[model samples]
Target chain A: SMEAEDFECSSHCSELSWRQNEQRRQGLFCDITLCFGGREFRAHRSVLAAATEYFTPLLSGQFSESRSGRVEMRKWSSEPGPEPDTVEAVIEYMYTGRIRVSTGSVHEVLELADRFLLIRLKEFCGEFLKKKLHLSNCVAIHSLAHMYTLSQLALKAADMIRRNFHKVIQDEEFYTLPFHLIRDWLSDLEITVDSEEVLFETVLKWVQRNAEERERYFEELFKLLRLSQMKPTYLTRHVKPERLVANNEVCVKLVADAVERHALRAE
Target chain B: YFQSMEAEDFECSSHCSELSWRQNEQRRQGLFCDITLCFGREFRAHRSVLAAATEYFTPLLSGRVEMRKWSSEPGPEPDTVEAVIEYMYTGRIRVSTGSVHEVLELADRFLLIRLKEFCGEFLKKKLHLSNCVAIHSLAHMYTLSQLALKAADMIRRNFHKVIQDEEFYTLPFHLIRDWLSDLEITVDSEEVLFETVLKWVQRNAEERERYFEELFKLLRLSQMKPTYLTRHVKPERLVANNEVCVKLVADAVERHALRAEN
Candidate 1:
């Protein structure tokens, strides 16, 4: 009855109004439309407060979410633009149009710089993440640049790992933070970093050594760590002391051990 | 046997991953013959460590830290200690029980964290619901965090009465708290009485709270960190319904309550 007028074109409101009057209402709508290119699209709205399903507190510094319905996410590396409402807006952005502008503004625009998808917002949200790719977001950096399904960002992450893996390895927190993730990423390419084990072994060994001997032992330990994992499969001149130093927190500072381990070396 | 089983189990998924075995089998023995070939032998024993250390273990001379071909065999041979040498050599260690704490120490001493981890895993896996009483103190003394956590869990569950014991609180407060965090139950108040002892012993509530928060965050978030807690704990990790988890929490609470009552 409603479709004869409203539902026929944009939902004549009879069926919808009746359904609502029947005391049945959904907090979300999934209005979809199809296009000639065989792509399905959404033009729905959702209540924001009812839909956020965070796995952890957003403040945990690991805010990640997976959509509940027939939703899947795949990233494309696009040139960098606007439609900030398009991408970083989170899932709610798709429903409520209340996009978190900080993430979306850059995320959506950048996501569709090259991608023609209507969700032009992801490219926009991806912008800030893109700029902070190196200093902050290696994951996004790796996703965008290294082994990308969509070729957009430069090979900045892989090059960083390739060139700066030595430095990265030297910084203990780097391993504690990203080794396994990066390992999985590179494992697809069979380029797993060896420095992780090397560092652990070095610390174990240096810890076992006498205080007087730790300095030299740690130096060797650092070398072995560098050599153990990321040594050039094709060695160049020599993998020296300074070469073992990366992110500049080496055997000299023992910055990681000193702070973390209670009885770390004196100097 | 395990290696070949593994080779088959994975379906030799990567023909090239098995390439060294293929290449070496083409040589001396159907087993890995060429030293340093990495595979095509028993236990992938062709790596330099196995080739060198196995040869050394064969001879069995005095003060023989690094050698080849030691024919003499001694106590604990071909078991836990030999496994350590094998590990020091090939970075792999498999073993059954006895003197595990020492072996782990030696593995750590050798900078064989993988081997240490593997051995730790072996012990952790072999954990018995009945053996918590025997191993808890030992695990604590050794700082075998993985095993300690398991043992603590086992003790908390299998021997819930012990939680109500005064001596139980005396075991080691901080270490037990560390394990509780491993178990993923925060002790904010004295909800679990034994946890009160943990808070009281912590001395500085402010610092301890901060420590617990940071520790909890680190344990929870860094999915790839090397610690046993990070390696194992998942969301809903210590669901109250789990017998072991309930036992542990109850034990902590009981022990704390008993401590206060005393």
Candidate 2:
């Protein structure tokens, strides 16, 4: 018997992807046409089926869409789905295993990836967003991450907010965060601030922005602040006269306890 | 919000390769397969995948294709067919010394030029003095010129030892003729080539005697010493009976005489 060994081509998958991508670009061997936002993109059903869980059943199963070979993707999501370019980028990633993500496109790409159930592409977008986390954007990123249930990105964004709470408050995007996210951040003991008085002022300004609608959240948001961390004079002069706080019985009692504790420490 | 942010390229490390694996698994589980290729055994596969890999299946897979067993000739074995299908999905295949020829043939039939090239490489690596002639022939058959040239060079450089192999005795008349005609073959003396040809003919002399004249024409008889021609060439009955052979030996001796006088 002659000696025999296994022969392998390491670049087979990469090369296959390149050829398939080229075939897709030329509209050759494309069995499926994806209609998105009035633009038609031709692609191979087999490639798409293999790349994502979302397309496997849509393209290969006994669904009517499988035989029709045309997918109208405009109403696939209740929310305004990814734009044409973002959907194109996601499809390109399905074929090429790579996509260009900017801060603007990463969120949309991540959403599309989530919708497609492309776990790897979704993780990639998460990491890209994690790397792009900033004070001005972390609030929105945190909310997006939380919406997608991407815990790692969510935690990273929350951590950014916790460390830069002082600076984050100045960003206009901070005030626009959902009520629960604001409460979560305010409740975090790790959040750094020059004084609890600064957090109080931030909360006051946030509530005052839409006081009529947000007045109900003032007690919950204010209780998260440690009144003892404030100077006695600031608590007495500033916090006591606040309209929302003065009107609330819980706010008066909380400030009275902190003032008494400060006086005892001075003696 | 991200308008001023820098754009960066993110690549999924294994998504492409994983796609191939998923396609292979889908093939194994018979999931989402639109075509069944039956070469004595039914192998379920996707038409789209097959079409993407090779042009041979592109049109054939348009609708239902009832593939039958090859008629009058041996078709690819089940394993070989499976390997080709796997290569289409995974871009890799396992080929061995025993199976490489069949795989190469199938690759060529399917228009899998890369697979054929890989087989050429495998054969080149397996080239030896005992098998170079056979590989050279196989390479020539497939038009793998690089492999053919390499095998040919190996045979030429080791012509003397190559003739000692059993493969040399079983070579067809045309192959022997071509080898003799190759002027690039390195030999200690023209007498060695003449003797080798004589041995090849004598192995099946009754059947091959008709080719003796044509075979002898390729040997550089004038390059052999006159003494060797008289002692070795004239004594062989196979060489002595042919008029062309006789004249060729006489012409060689005369050339030596003429050269001595010069």
TM-scores of the candidates, chain A only: 0.31, 0.72
Clashing pairs in 2: none
Model 2 Cα lDDT, one tens digit per residue, B75-153: 7677877888898888877888877887887788789888898898888888887788788878877899999999999
Q: Evaluate candidate 1 by giving its C-alpha RMSD to the native, one decimal.
A: 39.5
Q: Cα deviation of A85 in candidate 2 (Å)? A: 1.4
Q: Residue by residue across A143-177, what tens digits does model 2's lDDT show?
A: 89998899988888888888888898887888877
Error of 1 at B217 (Å): 23
Q: How is the predicted docking of candidate 1 categorized under the CAPRI scheme? A: incorrect
For model 1, what is the C-alpha lDDT against the true structure?
0.38
lDDT of 1 by residue, B1-262 (tens): 2211111111112222122222233222323222322111222223222222223222321011332322223323334554554443323334446556556555554454444555556666667654564566656665678788777776655444544455454444465555445543333322243333344345555544334332332222222222322233322333233555444444444554566667
- TM-score winner among the candidates? 2
Write down the TM-score of model 1's second chain: 0.33
Query: How many residue pairs clash (N, CA or C atoms closer than 3 angstroms) in each of the candidate models, in the order given?
Result: 51, 0
